[PDB]
Amino acid sequence: FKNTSFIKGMFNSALEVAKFEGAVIRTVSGIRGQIKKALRAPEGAFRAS
Amino acid sequence: FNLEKARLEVHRFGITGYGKGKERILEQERA
Amino acid sequence: TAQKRPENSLLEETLHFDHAVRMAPVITEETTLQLEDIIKQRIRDQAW
Amino acid sequence: MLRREARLRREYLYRKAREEAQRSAQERKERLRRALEENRLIPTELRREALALQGSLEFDDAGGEGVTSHVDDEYRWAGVEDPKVMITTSRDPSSRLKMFAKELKLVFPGAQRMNRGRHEVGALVRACKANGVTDLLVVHEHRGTPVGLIVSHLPFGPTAYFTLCNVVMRHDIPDLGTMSEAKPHLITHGFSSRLGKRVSDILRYLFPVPKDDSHRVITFANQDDYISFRHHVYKKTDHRNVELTEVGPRFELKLYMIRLGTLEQEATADVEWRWHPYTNTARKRVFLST
Amino acid sequence: KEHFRAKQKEEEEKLKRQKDLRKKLFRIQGQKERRNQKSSLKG
RNA sequence: CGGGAAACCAGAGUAUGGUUGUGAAACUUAAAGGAAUUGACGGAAGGGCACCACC
RNA sequence: AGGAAUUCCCAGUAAGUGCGGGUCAUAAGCUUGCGUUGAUUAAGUCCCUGCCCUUUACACACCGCCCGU
Ligand SMILES: [Mg+2]
Ligand SMILES: [Mg+2]
Ligand SMILES: [Mg+2]
Ligand SMILES: [Mg+2]
Structure with missing residues (x-):
């Protein structure tokens, strides 16, 4: 969704996302982002802006 | 008592005696 | 990736990473008392 | 009226663009004036056109308005007239959001709260301008807790965007009673930078001129770009000893956007200041204090 | 494009010798202005 | 009329840093124990107002 | 078809219905826009529960001293 994107494959549980909230992430293209909040529908996805 | 500070103040009061037209033209000369 | 690593492995890993932004401040009694001390000082001096 | x-x-907008030019012209004029008053060299920059600035010095007087300020143009009637504040919510408000909006009416003297039904945002601003509404407040909620606040100055004034962090309302606390409703004294603390002065001006002009003997105090305290809102009433039991009783809502503010236009002009208004969280040094930087 | 870029390098160097050569002459002019201060009031 | 250097004799501004310029607590929130023709309160009445009150 | 208590609400308002966006903050079973249909009662008093003030511009007319420590 424009800036906001849904990411899977980095983690495998909701406990994992809670440990790494606010971590700096980036793409191969060089766009920098932030981990915001975990998602429930798959096991280890999260929301990132 | 500073002479340099007093010297300017004495000058300005005197020039107003000349007149406002003469006040101006003398002021241009100083600048 | 997540597939290679076992489940819940990173919980004990103690990795190092960086945070993007500052965390929100936590309110406690001590912060309340210092803030009230500031308010009382302005009241005495009429520093409105 | 629209024209x-x-x-x-x-x-x-025309005056805002030329504000910097007049300030530089004014600054050059004072440097020449000091050089004339104390006999010294005219500065080499001021050596040419010195006569024209000297001619201007004679024309300057207390009668002129002086250099213009865009802040003064926005808040023209800040001191002379009492502000008129209107509070509204997002469409289909929650139960607790309506309860929060009821309390904000009590905090601001003379404020009014109106129901938001099927009103278009642009239509709301048009009605506020017609009836002389000075400031408009819009509050957002998430899962029954207030999360965002927008403050807009109606006569093409600045629009400030805030996010609420730790909201505790009077309705949660039992048996408090009734509020004082007097014109309050304002305490501004922690704002030292130029932007902090800009933000504190917007919050202060929401309130009218109080009385000297008023016992109502509202405090805005800045700490690491977080503004704490506190409301208190004090009683002087004896000299030098004062008691404080907390009344009214308690919440935190974090500014992230200031726009020149009104909230109906999102697609056109310029941004005076914005928070950039993806800056490489954004984590270790603060903006409301020096 | 490179020719214009090549040209701009010399005026950057040229202005450097311009200010240094003018610098020695500037001090002599400044000393003359001192005498005008004492006679500024007289005329 | 002769020479005058290709002659003759033998300067201010900012900015950024430095350097300097016999006890009031171990004791005390009773104005270290005040000021006052100037100070500190109480009651009653009147004028308003509220989806913090009524109907 | 949701007791006792308790909260909110005056006109395109209460309530119902759909269709979008995710906009450098917040927001995922959630957040915010936009349109559609559209009501009952009320336009006044200080009786309860409280709040803000007062009791020292001489047209006509009206009116003719708040109290106590
Ligand atoms: Mg509705
Ligand atoms: Mg509707
Ligand atoms: Mg029911
Ligand atoms: Mg709907």
Whole structure:
């Protein structure tokens, strides 16, 4: 969704996302982002802006 | 008592005696 | 990736990473008392 | 009226662009004045056109308005007239959001709260301008807790965007009673930078001129770009000893956007300041204090 | 494009010798202005 | 009329840093124990107002 | 078809219905826009529960001293 994107494959549980909230992430293209909040529908996805 | 500070103040009061037209033209000369 | 690593492995890993932004401040009694001390000082001096 | 409003906006924007030029022209004028008063060299920059600035010095007087300020143009009637504040919510408000909006009416003297039904945002601003509403407040909620606040100055004034962090309302606390409703004293603390002065001005002009003997105090304290809102009433039991009783809501503010236009002008208004969280050094930087 | 870029390098160097050569002459002019201060009031 | 250097004799501004310029607590929130023709309160009445009250 | 208590609400308002966006903050079973249909009662008093003030511009007319420590 424009800036906001849904990411899977980095983690495998909701406990994992809670440990790494606010971590700096980036793409191969060089766009920098932030981990915001975990998602429930798959096991280890999260929301990132 | 500073002479340099007093010297300017004495000058300005005197020039107003000349007149406002003469006040101006003398002021241009100083600048 | 997540597939290679076992489940819940990173919980004990103690990795190092960086945070993007500052965390929100936590309110406690001590912060309340210092803030009230500031308010009382302005009241005495009429520093409105 | 619509033509008049458009004309006043172009006049305001025209003056804002030339504000910096007049300040530099004013600054050069004072340097020449010091050189004349104390006999010294005219500065080499001021050596040419010195006569023209000297001619201007004679023409300057207390009668002129002086250098213009875009802040003064926005808050023209800040001191002379009492502000008129209107509070509204997002469409289909929650139960607790309506309860929060009821309390904000009590905090601001003379404020009014109106129901938001199927009103278009642009239509709301048009009605506020017609009836002389000075400031408009819009509050957002998430899962029954207030999360965002927008403050807009109606006569093409600045629009400030806030996010609420730790909201505790009077309705949660039992058996408090009734509020004082007197004109309050304002305490501003922690704002030292230029932007902090800009933000504190917007919050202060929401309130009217109080009385000297008023016992109502509202405090805005800045700490690491977080503004704490506190409301208190004090009693002087004896000299030098004062008691404080907390009344009213308690919440935190974090500014992230200031725009020149009104909230109906999202697609056109310029941004005076914005928070950039993806900056490489954004984590270790603060903006409301020096 | 490179020719214009090549040209701009010399005026950057040229202005450097311009200010240094003018610098020695500037001090002599400044000393003359001192005498005008004492006679500024007289005329 | 002769020479005058290709002659003759033998300067201010900012900015950024430095350097300097016999006890009031171990004791005390009773104005270290005040000021006052100037100070500190109480009651009653009147004028308003509220989806913090009524109907 | 949701007791006792308790909260909110005056006109395109209460309530119902759909269709979008995710906009450098917040927001995922959630957040915010936009349109559609559209009501009952009320336009006045200080009786309860409280709040803000007062009791020292001489047209006509009206009116003719708040109290106590
Ligand atoms: Mg509704
Ligand atoms: Mg509706
Ligand atoms: Mg029911
Ligand atoms: Mg709907």
